[PDB]
Design a protein around this ligand. Structure first.
Ligand SMILES: *[P@@](=O)(CCCCCCCCCCC)OC
Length: 197
């Protein structure tokens, strides 16, 4: 449901082909929040339960609302947590294709983590989806050091966080349809582009 730790719980001897690491929004529950489960279900349908590992960013990532105001849009502790998960995936399953995503503060966290990641691991992330990207204007719709073709940003008209503000308006809470269709569609397409089918 809202908590998935497939990577941490997974057996290294039976690695999945695809590993999805997702960061939830501020004040959301579990480690997947409101959007993560929808994306997860669709990935499982495409690759099979044993074909994909769903891993939310928990641990030190408290998804504290106030942290949106920090320099990188999240805390240093949260970034260290997500970096650690990417590193665990790389070590536990070196042949797996990675995909990532984040919503709101989680999108800023995903961008910061990917920017800091060792290039060899970063290059394994076939696609990343960001919803209500809090650093959209500041980063010009990109994730630093990461290709535009592997990035998909979902920013609703009227969602003030996409336009340089930290005000939470109604459009910020309207990403449900995107998480159910275009987001997983993009991720599946990007994985298949490199793994074939
Ligand atoms: P997103 O992380 C929402 C981020 C926007 C809110 C940032 C403002 C923090 C200070 C609020 C006090 C006025 O999760 C859905």
């Amino acid at each position: 449901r809202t908590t998935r730790d497939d990577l941490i719980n997974g057996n290294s001897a039976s690695c999945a082909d695809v590993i999805f690491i997702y960061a939830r929004g501020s004040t959301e529950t579990g480690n997947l929040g409101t959007l993560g489960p929808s994306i997860a279900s669709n990935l499982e349908s495409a690759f099979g339960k044993d074909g994909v590992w769903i891993q939310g960013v928990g641990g030190a990532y408290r998804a504290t609302l106030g942290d949106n105001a920090l320099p990188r849009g999240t805390s240093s502790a949260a970034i260290r947590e997500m970096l650690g998960l990417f590193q665990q995936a790389n070590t536990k399953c070196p042949d797996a294709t990675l995909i990532a995503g984040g919503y709101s503060q989680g999108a800023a966290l995903a961008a910061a983590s990917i920017e800091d990641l060792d290039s060899a691991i970063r290059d394994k992330i076939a696609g990343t989806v960001l919803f209500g990207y809090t650093k959209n204007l500041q980063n010009r719709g990109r994730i630093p050091n990461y290709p535009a073709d592997r990035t998909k940003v979902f920013c609703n008209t009227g969602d003030l966080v996409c336009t340089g503000s930290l005000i939470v308006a109604a459009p910020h809470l309207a990403y449900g349809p995107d998480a159910r269709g275009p987001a997983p569609e993009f991720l599946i397409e990007k994985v298949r582009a490199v793994r074939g089918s």
